[PDB]
Design a binder for these strands. Structure first.
Ligand SMILES: [Mg+2]
Ligand SMILES: [Mg+2]
Ligand SMILES: [Mg+2]
Ligand SMILES: [Mg+2]
Ligand SMILES: [Mg+2]
Ligand SMILES: [Mg+2]
Ligand SMILES: [Mg+2]
Ligand SMILES: [Mg+2]
Ligand SMILES: [Mg+2]
Ligand SMILES: [Mg+2]
Ligand SMILES: [Mg+2]
Ligand SMILES: [Mg+2]
Ligand SMILES: [Mg+2]
Ligand SMILES: [Mg+2]
Ligand SMILES: [Mg+2]
Ligand SMILES: [Mg+2]
Ligand SMILES: [Mg+2]
Ligand SMILES: [Mg+2]
Ligand SMILES: [Mg+2]
Ligand SMILES: [Mg+2]
Ligand SMILES: [Mg+2]
Ligand SMILES: [Mg+2]
Ligand SMILES: [Mg+2]
Ligand SMILES: [Mg+2]
Ligand SMILES: [Mg+2]
Ligand SMILES: [Mg+2]
Ligand SMILES: [Mg+2]
Ligand SMILES: [Mg+2]
Ligand SMILES: [Mg+2]
Ligand SMILES: [Mg+2]
Ligand SMILES: [Mg+2]
Ligand SMILES: [Mg+2]
Ligand SMILES: [Mg+2]
Ligand SMILES: [Mg+2]
Ligand SMILES: [Mg+2]
Ligand SMILES: [Mg+2]
Ligand SMILES: [Mg+2]
Ligand SMILES: [Mg+2]
Ligand SMILES: [Mg+2]
Ligand SMILES: [Mg+2]
Ligand SMILES: [Mg+2]
Ligand SMILES: [Mg+2]
Ligand SMILES: [Mg+2]
Ligand SMILES: [Mg+2]
Ligand SMILES: [Mg+2]
Ligand SMILES: [Mg+2]
Ligand SMILES: [Mg+2]
Ligand SMILES: [Mg+2]
Ligand SMILES: [Mg+2]
Ligand SMILES: [Mg+2]
Ligand SMILES: [Mg+2]
Ligand SMILES: [Mg+2]
Ligand SMILES: [Mg+2]
Ligand SMILES: [Mg+2]
Ligand SMILES: [Mg+2]
Ligand SMILES: [Mg+2]
Ligand SMILES: [Mg+2]
Ligand SMILES: [Mg+2]
Ligand SMILES: [Mg+2]
Ligand SMILES: [Mg+2]
Ligand SMILES: [Mg+2]
Ligand SMILES: [Mg+2]
Ligand SMILES: [Mg+2]
Ligand SMILES: [Mg+2]
Ligand SMILES: [Mg+2]
Ligand SMILES: [Mg+2]
Ligand SMILES: [Mg+2]
Ligand SMILES: [Mg+2]
Ligand SMILES: [Mg+2]
Ligand SMILES: [Mg+2]
Ligand SMILES: [Mg+2]
Ligand SMILES: [Mg+2]
Ligand SMILES: [Mg+2]
Ligand SMILES: [Mg+2]
Ligand SMILES: [Mg+2]
Ligand SMILES: [Mg+2]
Ligand SMILES: [Mg+2]
Ligand SMILES: [Mg+2]
Ligand SMILES: [Mg+2]
Ligand SMILES: [Mg+2]
Ligand SMILES: [Mg+2]
Ligand SMILES: [Mg+2]
Ligand SMILES: [Mg+2]
Ligand SMILES: [Mg+2]
Ligand SMILES: [Mg+2]
Ligand SMILES: [Mg+2]
Ligand SMILES: [Mg+2]
Ligand SMILES: [Mg+2]
Ligand SMILES: [Mg+2]
Ligand SMILES: [Mg+2]
Ligand SMILES: [Mg+2]
Ligand SMILES: [Mg+2]
Ligand SMILES: [Mg+2]
Ligand SMILES: [Mg+2]
Ligand SMILES: [Mg+2]
Ligand SMILES: [Mg+2]
Ligand SMILES: [Mg+2]
Ligand SMILES: [Mg+2]
Ligand SMILES: [Mg+2]
Ligand SMILES: [Mg+2]
Ligand SMILES: [Mg+2]
Ligand SMILES: [Mg+2]
Ligand SMILES: [Mg+2]
Ligand SMILES: [Mg+2]
Ligand SMILES: [Mg+2]
Ligand SMILES: [Mg+2]
Ligand SMILES: [Mg+2]
Ligand SMILES: [Mg+2]
Ligand SMILES: [Mg+2]
Ligand SMILES: [Mg+2]
Ligand SMILES: [Mg+2]
Ligand SMILES: [Mg+2]
Ligand SMILES: [Mg+2]
Ligand SMILES: [Mg+2]
Ligand SMILES: [Mg+2]
Ligand SMILES: [Mg+2]
Ligand SMILES: [Mg+2]
Ligand SMILES: [Mg+2]
Ligand SMILES: [Mg+2]
Ligand SMILES: [Mg+2]
Ligand SMILES: [Mg+2]
Ligand SMILES: [Mg+2]
Ligand SMILES: [Mg+2]
Ligand SMILES: [Mg+2]
Ligand SMILES: [Mg+2]
Ligand SMILES: [Mg+2]
Ligand SMILES: [Mg+2]
Lengths: 386, 155
RNA sequence: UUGGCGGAAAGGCCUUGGGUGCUUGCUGGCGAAUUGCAAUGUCAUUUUGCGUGGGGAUAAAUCAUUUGUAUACGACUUAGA
RNA sequence: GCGUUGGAUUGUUCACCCACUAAUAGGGAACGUGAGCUGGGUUUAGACCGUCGUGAGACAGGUUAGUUUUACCCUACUGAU
RNA sequence: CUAUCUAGCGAAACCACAGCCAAGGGAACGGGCUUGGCAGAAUCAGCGGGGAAAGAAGACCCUGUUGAGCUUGACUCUAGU
RNA sequence: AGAACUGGUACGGACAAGGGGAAUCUGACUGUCUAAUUAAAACAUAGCAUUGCGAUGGUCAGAAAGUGAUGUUGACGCAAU
RNA sequence: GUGAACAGCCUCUAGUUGAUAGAAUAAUGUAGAUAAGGGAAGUCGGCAAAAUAGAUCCGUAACUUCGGGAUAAGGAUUGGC
RNA sequence: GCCCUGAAAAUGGAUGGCGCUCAAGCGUGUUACCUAUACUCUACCGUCAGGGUUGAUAUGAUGCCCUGACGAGUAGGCAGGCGUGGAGGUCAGUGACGAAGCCUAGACCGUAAGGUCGGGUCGAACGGCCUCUAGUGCAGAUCUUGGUGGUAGUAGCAAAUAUUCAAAUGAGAACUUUGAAGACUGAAGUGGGGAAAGGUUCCACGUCAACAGCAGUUGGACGUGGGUUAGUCGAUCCUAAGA
RNA sequence: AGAACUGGCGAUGCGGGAUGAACCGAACGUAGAGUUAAGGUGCCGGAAUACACGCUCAUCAGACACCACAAAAGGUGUUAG
RNA sequence: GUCGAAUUUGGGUAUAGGGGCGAAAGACUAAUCGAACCAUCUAGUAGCUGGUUCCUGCCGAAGUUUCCCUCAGGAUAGCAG
RNA sequence: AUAUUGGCGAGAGACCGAUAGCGAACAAGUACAGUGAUGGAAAGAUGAAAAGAACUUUGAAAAGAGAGUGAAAAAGUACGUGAAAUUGUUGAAAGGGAAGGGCAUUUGAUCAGACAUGG
C-alpha cells in the first residue's frame, strides 16, 4: 500500500486500445498547414515497402567526434511507382467538422482501381463506373458544374489517387486508393489542377526531395494474441511461481473492485496504425535509371535491388523513396508518406546528405558480393560455364 | 399416432416418428429447427451438404461456448456446427415420411416439412469414476423425434 | 412559365409572363328543419402490403476454393470465367 | 506533470551501513495485492536446550523439521465476432 | 503434449433472487435502498479486480453447573501386597 | 607394453558417468520411526554405571486353580532403570 | 553386439503395434533444449539449473582412534590404421 | 454583520440533483399556494355499549329493530370460522345417460381460510346437514424420500515413441479379418509357466439391445453348446511353530 | 461505560427530514368530499422565477433544527454602530 | 537414502481393546487409534442451535423487583388475557 | 382362580392404505455390502377378455406409416388415472445493466347481468 519502490508504468496509455486496425491502409489523420502562395502540391504519396539495406556517407555535423567522417546507417527502400489521379473531393467547413460536399470522378478508370470496388471481380459484370462516365459524354454540364461548386464552396480540396500496383512485384492486382490534400494556392487553382490531372500520372520527385524529412503512416506488422510479458513489457514472474509466470501478479487492488483500464492484460499485439515522423530522405530513385544504387564515388552500373531480389518482395523496377532508418509496417505493405506538419531546423533536419555507397549484397543470407560481375571476378570460373 | 400440436391438413400430409433414439437431444433439436418449414428437397439437399461440411446447422439455444464458423453467415449467426449423428437420424425420419407420403399419393414435389419436433426421451445412465473414490453420473440424453410433411397449397 | 439567390443540416427563397378555381369590395334569387334539448358529427401523416398505366434500370454479396502483408475460432488480406 | 535507484547483515516491516544519483520524499487503496506467487517469520502434530513446574506440562525465551486446494459461472478488465 | 476449432461422447462444484458504477445513509465497506453517472440484440478467446466466491455448524478465544487423553498428597475408592 | 602412419586437435565422440575445498552447531558410527504434512539433532546401538534375585527366589501373568512367562534357565544368569 | 556388467543403447526367437479420432500451431501452461557480455548482483537460502564424471599413467594436505583422511586436491592421456 | 485568511489525505462526486450572484444566498416582514393513513361531514364493514320487540296474528328470540361510541400491533391470551382421514344419524342425497381425480391469464359467492359452476380429461365410486373422533392443514428445520433444473453440449476424453496402403466381410469399416509396409517390448520382456485369488473368464458356433466413457461387423460382453482322463503330478502320510 | 424523571424505538405503518429504528408532524377498519400538520412552492416536483427593506462577490462564496464539524488569531473588503 | 545384512520377503503360527504390539511417532492394531470394529442399553441428557403447518375478529406485553454454584437458566412479584 | 410381543387353530377393529402399514402386500431377511460380528433395500394396478396389432408398405434393423383388435389404444406387456418441477413444438406478447409487485387508466383480448311489448 504505496508500492515498496517506484518504477515507471509499463507501456503507453496513448496508444490504446491495443486492437487491430480497421484498415490495412493507415489513415492520414493530418495534412500540413496549407500555404496557398506556393504551387499546387501533393501533400502525401502512396507506396509499397520493399525492404532495407545499409549505406555509407560522410557526416556533416560540426562539433561531433564523427564530423567529416564516414558513418554506416540503415535505410528502408519503399517501392514508389507514379500514382494516378482519378478524382477530386470537396470539403466544406461546418460547426460539426470538415464535410465532404461532392466527389467528382475521372471519365476513364483503370482496371486496377475498378478492382478495388469489387469483392468478387472475376465473376463480376465489371459495371463499376459505367454509368458515371456518361456524365462526360453530354459535352460536360454534369461534371462541369460539380467542379463548379467545389470551387465556390469547399475550404479544402483533396485528390483521389491510386497506386499502379501492377508495376509492383506484388501479386495483389487490386490497387490502393487514397485522398491526398492539395496544398497549392486558391481552391479554384486547386480543382483546376485536379481536373487537368484526371487519368494522368504524378510521381514522387514532384512531391519529395533529398534531405527532406518526411513522415511515414502505416499499419504495424501484426502478431496475434500476445501474453502480457511481451505485449506490455512487464517483468517475468519468478521461476517458482505456480500457474505460470508470463503474467502480472497483481491485476489490481481490492478497491476499486474492478480490473482497471490501465493494467496490462494479454491480447492483440501488432497490426496497429502508427504515424512515425522525421524520416529524412536519402535518395529519390528513378526507375528509368540503371545506376539506382550507384554513387558519385561508387560509379558501378548497378540498381538498388540487392542480389537475389529483396527478400519476400522482388526487384525495384520503379521510382523509389529511400529513407533513413526504419518505418512502421512490413514488406509488401502499403505506406503513406506524408511531408512534415512542421518546419524543422534541427540542423540534423537541415543536413544535406551525399551517399557514398549503397549495400547491394544479398539479404537472403550472409551476402559477400555487390554485383555478379564482382562475384565471378573473384570466385574464378565454375564447373558450369565456358 | 397422437403428435404435438399441428395445423396441417391431415389429408394432404403424412408423418414420421422416432422414439428413444440415442442421438443428442440438444443437438438434434438444433438441426430439427434448422429445416423446420423447409421444402422437403431443399431440406434434404441441405442436410446432405451439411454432412459434407459445405454448410452448417445454426446453433441458437443449446449453444454456449460453441465455436464460431464462417458458415453461419447464411443464417445471420456466428455459432454453427455439423452434428452428423443428428443430421443422420433426422435424415432417416425425413425419408420414412417421404416414403409414407408417396404411399399416400401425395405429390412429392409439393412437400415441405410442416412440423418437426424433438423433445427428450428417458435418460440412459452410466458411471464415471471421479477422483477420491467417488462416482458420478455419465448419462445419455436420448431424443424422441417426430415430423410431418405436407402438400403446399395452391392460392 | 422567365430570371435569380441559398451548402451551416443549402432541399428553401425572391422574381417574370400568362392560364385557371375562388373572391365577403358590393347588389340580388334559392337552399338548410325531423341529426328531434349535449353525448358521438373537419379528418391530419406514418409506415406496409397488394392493385391499375406511364416512365426507367438489367447487379452483387456470402458459402466453397485460394493467398499469408492476417489469424485461437470467427475476423483480416489476396486470387480465380 | 514527471521521477524517486543498485547492494552487505536481518523472515522482518523497521533498523544500519557501502554505493550511485537530479533526487534516492512521506503516505493510502480490507495495515492494496496468497483460486497472483513465495512460505523465510508466526502459531497444530516430531525434536534439543534454558527458565518454570513434584508432575502431566508451560514459556512474545533460544533452536530444527514441517501438504499453500477449485474458476468452465456472473461481472469487471483485455482483446475478438 | 495441451489449450484452441471439428465428429462422437459427456460429468462436477455452486445456485435466496441475481449480476454496471460514484456518493449518501445503513448492522459503522451495497447487486438491490436514496440522489446522481448512465443504459442497445446475440456472442468467442483470455483473465484472476469483485462476487466480504467455493470447500467443515471456527481448530483460535469465551461460555456450558458438556466431555475425553494425561498428571498429582485434589476428593472418594480398588486389584494387589 | 611399445613404435610408425593418419584427421578441420578429433577420439569414455551415442550411451554411460563423483563437483571440489576451509569451517561452526549437532548425533560416534551401520541401523530405527510419525502408512497419508515432521527422517531429524528424536528412537536404537556397542560401551559405562546403577538396582534386585540362590528357586520356600526376583520381575511379571490369571476370576480361580494339581494354572502361567522368564525356564530346554541358575549370578560369565534372569529381571529393572 | 557394445561394454566391467543381469547398466544403458541396437538386434534374434516369441509377443505386441492396445490405449477416441480429424484440422490447426494464439495466449498461458506441462515436459525437453539453447542463449551474447556479466557471473549469485537473484533469494530466507544457489531453491532450480549448470558444472564434474569411464580408464590408464603421474601426483596428493591438515588431521587421526594409525584403520583412515583419499577418486583428497592437482595434472597428462584416450580415435583409425 | 457578511465576506477574505487561518482551512492538509488518499476510486471520480455531491446545499439530494440541476443550477442559482438586486439569488434559486444571508437576516427580517407580509400575503397567497401545495400536501398525510391526522381533523370535519357522509356511506359501508366489524367491535363494544345502551335500549325496543313473538298479546293472537306463514319463513330466522342464540333472532328482528332503534341509537351512540370506537378500530395500530410483536411475544402472547381469547373468540368466531375455513379445510382434511375415519365414526353415529339423516337428505329413501349424486353417479357408467359418467363417481372421484386432474387440466383450464372461463364464470359466480365470501374481508379471508375457502365455496360453487362451465369446458376438456377421466372411468367407480361420492357428497350435503346435525353430531362423533383424530396419526387433521407446510415454504423453510445444512429437514426425509423421490423426481427435475441452470451450470453445459461445458470441464474434459493429452502419461506409457507410431502408425500407413490395399483386399476381404458387412446395411454400415480410422477401430473386424487376411496381405504388405513402418515400428516397439529387446529376455531384468509387452516372451514361456506357475503360487495366492478368481470360477468358466477356457474352446466352438451364432451374435450387437445393453456394457468395452469415439466406434464396433470385434470382446474377458450377449445367446447356445463343448471341454479338465494319473499306481508314478499334487493333496492324502509325517513332523514344525502352534492348535 | 454507568444512574435519574419523562417521552420514544423495540411491537408501528403513515406525512416530513434526499437517504435513515429512535428527530418533526401524526398513530392506521373499506371509501368519498373538504381542511390541515410538520415540511415545502426556479426546474427535477404538487405549490408565487410572489410582494418588501437590507446585507453578501469568495482564482476555496453560501444555502436551514436533530446532522453529517471547526479553533486560537488576523484583514486599509464592505456595511452599520 | 541404502543395496550382503540390526537385509528384503512368501505361507504358516502367536499376541485382541484400557487389551495388544511399539529400535518410542501416542506410532501401529483391515482407508478407523490420545482407546478398534459390531449390536444393544438408546428416542442416552442438553439451562444450547435449528424448525414448528389454516383464516379472520378482540384485548395486548416484558427486558424491571427479590432469592438462586444466580450471570445464555429458573423461582418470585409486576406488566397481559 | 393367575401370566403369556413364542407356537397351532379361530373371530374381530371409528387401525394403515404401497414415502402409509411389519424391513418385506412382489422369486424379502431376497438383491447388494462387509474378513467378520453384522448391515440390508428398491420393487403392487393393460383390458371383461390377449382380442398382445393378421396383412401391406418404408427400413440393415429397431421401428415408422397404413390396416386390424377393443367400449376405449386419449388402455400397445414403456401399458388405469397421469399433478408439479423441468422440456419440445405452435400461437400471442414484451424486452437500452435482472425479473416479479401496488394504486390508476389507455390499448388489445375475453366474459358477463337483461326481460318483453303490441302485430
Ligand atoms: Mg511512492
Ligand atoms: Mg508474452
Ligand atoms: Mg521491443
Ligand atoms: Mg510452488
Ligand atoms: Mg537476412
Ligand atoms: Mg413418445
Ligand atoms: Mg442453455
Ligand atoms: Mg473452452
Ligand atoms: Mg461464455
Ligand atoms: Mg451468434
Ligand atoms: Mg476419472
Ligand atoms: Mg479407490
Ligand atoms: Mg363551377
Ligand atoms: Mg357532452
Ligand atoms: Mg504460417
Ligand atoms: Mg490503516
Ligand atoms: Mg494486507
Ligand atoms: Mg486476492
Ligand atoms: Mg494460496
Ligand atoms: Mg508458513
Ligand atoms: Mg515456515
Ligand atoms: Mg511443533
Ligand atoms: Mg524453524
Ligand atoms: Mg524435512
Ligand atoms: Mg466454476
Ligand atoms: Mg465437441
Ligand atoms: Mg454459480
Ligand atoms: Mg457502489
Ligand atoms: Mg466523502
Ligand atoms: Mg448523495
Ligand atoms: Mg471505508
Ligand atoms: Mg452482495
Ligand atoms: Mg425505500
Ligand atoms: Mg437509481
Ligand atoms: Mg476474484
Ligand atoms: Mg464461485
Ligand atoms: Mg486449545
Ligand atoms: Mg451457570
Ligand atoms: Mg465450572
Ligand atoms: Mg475442560
Ligand atoms: Mg481422547
Ligand atoms: Mg493417593
Ligand atoms: Mg504416595
Ligand atoms: Mg552455529
Ligand atoms: Mg545418526
Ligand atoms: Mg545411519
Ligand atoms: Mg509422514
Ligand atoms: Mg534419513
Ligand atoms: Mg517425509
Ligand atoms: Mg563415553
Ligand atoms: Mg499374453
Ligand atoms: Mg485415456
Ligand atoms: Mg535439442
Ligand atoms: Mg549467458
Ligand atoms: Mg567467473
Ligand atoms: Mg536483494
Ligand atoms: Mg544477496
Ligand atoms: Mg535461512
Ligand atoms: Mg532453509
Ligand atoms: Mg540442486
Ligand atoms: Mg543452461
Ligand atoms: Mg554449456
Ligand atoms: Mg594416518
Ligand atoms: Mg594414439
Ligand atoms: Mg497546507
Ligand atoms: Mg458545503
Ligand atoms: Mg451562519
Ligand atoms: Mg428570505
Ligand atoms: Mg423567523
Ligand atoms: Mg420570509
Ligand atoms: Mg380514510
Ligand atoms: Mg386490531
Ligand atoms: Mg369445520
Ligand atoms: Mg362446513
Ligand atoms: Mg371430514
Ligand atoms: Mg387417519
Ligand atoms: Mg396456470
Ligand atoms: Mg368427472
Ligand atoms: Mg374399472
Ligand atoms: Mg364436528
Ligand atoms: Mg402430523
Ligand atoms: Mg415442501
Ligand atoms: Mg425452502
Ligand atoms: Mg454431444
Ligand atoms: Mg471441450
Ligand atoms: Mg488431463
Ligand atoms: Mg500414448
Ligand atoms: Mg485403409
Ligand atoms: Mg487405430
Ligand atoms: Mg528396439
Ligand atoms: Mg536390461
Ligand atoms: Mg465369437
Ligand atoms: Mg462406448
Ligand atoms: Mg455403440
Ligand atoms: Mg459365452
Ligand atoms: Mg422523544
Ligand atoms: Mg425483541
Ligand atoms: Mg410511530
Ligand atoms: Mg439531511
Ligand atoms: Mg416538540
Ligand atoms: Mg433531477
Ligand atoms: Mg410545479
Ligand atoms: Mg475579484
Ligand atoms: Mg442550533
Ligand atoms: Mg470588518
Ligand atoms: Mg507428543
Ligand atoms: Mg489403519
Ligand atoms: Mg473404514
Ligand atoms: Mg426427542
Ligand atoms: Mg388496542
Ligand atoms: Mg419494581
Ligand atoms: Mg446454594
Ligand atoms: Mg441465543
Ligand atoms: Mg391361522
Ligand atoms: Mg413399504
Ligand atoms: Mg412421501
Ligand atoms: Mg421399506
Ligand atoms: Mg455393518
Ligand atoms: Mg387398475
Ligand atoms: Mg401404474
Ligand atoms: Mg411396427
Ligand atoms: Mg376413455
Ligand atoms: Mg386408459
Ligand atoms: Mg405390444
Ligand atoms: Mg398411463
Ligand atoms: Mg422435452
Ligand atoms: Mg353484452
Amino acid at each position: 500500500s504505496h508500492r515498496k519502490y517506484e518504477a515507471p508504468r509499463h507501456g503507453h496509455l496513448g496508444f490504446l486500445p491495443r486492437k487491430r486496425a480497421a484498415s490495412i491502409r493507415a489513415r492520414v489523420k493530418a495534412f500540413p498547414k496549407d500555404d496557398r502562395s506556393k504551387p499546387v502540391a501533393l501533400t502525401s504519396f502512396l507506396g509499397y515497402k520493399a525492404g532495407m539495406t545499409t549505406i555509407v556517407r560522410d557526416l556533416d555535423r560540426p562539433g561531433s567526434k564523427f564530423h567529416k567522417r564516414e558513418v554506416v546507417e540503415a535505410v528502408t527502400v519503399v517501392d514508389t511507382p507514379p500514382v494516378v489521379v482519378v478524382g477530386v473531393v470537396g470539403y466544406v467547413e461546418t460547426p460539426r467538422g470538415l464535410r465532404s460536399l461532392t466527389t467528382v470522378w475521372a471519365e476513364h478508370l483503370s482496371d486496377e482501381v475498378k478492382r478495388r470496388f469489387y469483392k468478387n471481380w472475376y465473376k463480376s459484370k465489371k459495371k463499376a463506373f459505367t454509368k458515371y462516365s456518361a456524365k462526360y459524354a453530354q459535352d460536360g454540364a454534369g461534371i462541369e458544374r460539380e467542379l463548379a461548386r467545389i470551387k465556390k464552396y469547399a475550404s479544402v480540396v483533396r485528390v483521389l489517387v491510386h497506386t499502379q500496383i501492377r508495376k509492383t512485384p506484388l501479386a495483389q492486382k487490386k490497387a490502393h486508393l487514397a485522398e491526398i490534400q492539395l496544398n497549392g494556392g486558391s481552391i479554384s487553382e486547386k480543382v483546376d489542377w485536379a481536373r487537368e490531372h484526371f487519368e494522368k500520372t504524378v510521381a514522387v520527385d514532384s512531391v519529395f526531395e533529398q534531405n527532406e524529412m518526411i513522415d511515414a503512416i502505416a499499419v504495424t506488422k501484426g502478431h496475434g494474441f500476445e501474453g502480457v510479458t511481451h505485449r506490455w513489457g512487464t517483468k517475468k514472474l519468478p521461476r517458482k511461481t505456480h500457474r505460470g509466470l508470463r503474467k502480472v501478479a497483481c491485476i489490481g487492488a481490492w478497491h476499486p473492485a474492478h480490473v482497471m483500464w490501465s493494467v496490462a492484460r494479454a491480447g492483440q499485439r501488432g497490426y496497429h496504425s502508427r504515424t512515425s515522423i522525421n524520416h529524412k530522405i536519402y535518395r529519390v530513385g528513378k526507375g528509368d535509371d540503371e545506376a539506382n544504387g550507384a554513387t558519385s564515388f561508387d560509379r558501378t552500373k548497378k540498381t538498388i535491388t540487392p542480389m537475389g531480389g529483396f527478400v519476400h518482395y522482388g526487384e525495384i523496377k520503379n521510382d523509389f523513396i529511400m529513407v533513413k532508418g526504419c518505418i512502421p509496417g512490413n514488406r509488401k505493405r502499403i505506406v503513406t508518406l506524408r511531408k512534415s506538419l512542421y518546419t524543422n531546423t534541427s540542423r540534423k533536419a537541415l543536413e544535406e546528405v551525399s551517399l557514398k555507397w549503397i549495400d547491394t549484397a544479398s539479404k537472403f543470407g550472409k551476402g559477400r558480393f555487390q554485383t555478379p560481375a564482382e562475384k565471378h571476378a573473384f570466385m574464378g570460373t565454375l564447373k558450369k560455364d565456358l | 399416432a397422437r403428435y404435438g400440436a399441428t395445423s396441417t391438413n391431415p389429408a394432404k400430409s403424412a408423418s414420421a416418428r422416432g422414439s428413444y433414439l440415442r442421438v443428442s437431444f440438444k443437438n438434434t433439436r438444433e438441426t430439427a429447427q434448422a429445416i423446420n418449414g423447409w421444402e422437403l428437397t431443399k431440406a434434404q439437399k441441405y442436410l446432405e451438404q451439411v454432412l459434407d461440411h459445405q454448410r452448417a446447422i445454426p446453433f441458437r439455444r443449446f449453444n454456449s461456448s460453441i465455436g464460431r464458423t464462417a458458415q453461419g453467415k447464411e443464417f445471420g449467426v456466428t455459432k454453427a456446427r455439423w452434428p452428423a449423428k443428428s443430421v443422420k437420424f433426422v435424415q432417416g425420419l425425413l425419408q420414412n415420411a417421404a416414403a409414407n407420403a408417396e404411399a399416400k399419393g401425395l405429390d412429392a414435389t409439393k412437400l415441405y416439412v410442416s412440423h418437426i419436433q424433438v423433445n427428450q426421451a428417458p435418460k440412459q445412465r452410466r458411471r464415471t469414476y471421479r477422483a477420491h473414490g467417488r462416482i458420478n453420473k455419465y448419462e445419455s440424453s436420448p431424443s424422441h423425434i417426430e415430423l410431418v410433411v405436407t402438400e403446399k397449397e395452391e392460392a
